[PDB]
Amino acid sequence: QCANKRCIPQSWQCDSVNDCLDNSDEDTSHCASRTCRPGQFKCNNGRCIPQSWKCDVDNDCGDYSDEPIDECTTAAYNCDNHTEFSCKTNYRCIPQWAVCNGFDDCRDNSDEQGCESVPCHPSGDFRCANHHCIPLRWKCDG
């Protein structure tokens, strides 16, 4: 809820953009003291982000508050083993299913390299001409 009693999505609060038309969401006093709700990391800028976006490599808070390199470069932020895929250049850990999905997930095209070698599921997959795997429910779907 804002000052003028119009209430907005909690993600837009202190997002550097005036939404409540009274600049209550971008007031420095509130944007400093406020605490991000459970599960979200807080930036020094006052923005709230999901905790999964710390060490995301990409900037989230605008001030690079979400990328402490020293912390992100230790063992404390390793990839989830046997469930996530690690990039080859950056320190990003991406969900494994994002490998070979027709999008640059690792930001250096690591996830989309050597796509011709990954085997599709023996029963529940359809193999594309560009060696992608799609769920069989999407063939002939239109």
Binding site: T73, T74, A75, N78, C79, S86, C87, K88, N90, Y91
Partner: protein, 70 residues
């Protein structure tokens, strides 16, 4: 240069050197730092640190089995 999980290029002189060079301990993970010992698995005897000697060398008064481990 072996590529650490966090993107550090480390020379192969430091892989499994019992020192965390990468900063995350990826270089010294157990995937490369197991180095299994001689199992001596089929059709021979085994004594001490993996001496896969033939069965005739069991307790035959000939100290070949490390420090006479049999």
């Amino acid at each position: 240069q072996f590529t650490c999980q966090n993107g550090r290029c480390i020379p192969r002189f430091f892989v499994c050197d019992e020192d965390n060079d990468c900063g995350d301990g990826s270089d010294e993970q157990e995937h490369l730092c197991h180095t299994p010992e001689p199992t001596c698995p089929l059709h021979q005897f085994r004594c001490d640190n993996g001496h896969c000697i033939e069965m005739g060398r069991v307790c035959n008064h000939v100290d070949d089995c490390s420090d006479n481990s049999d």
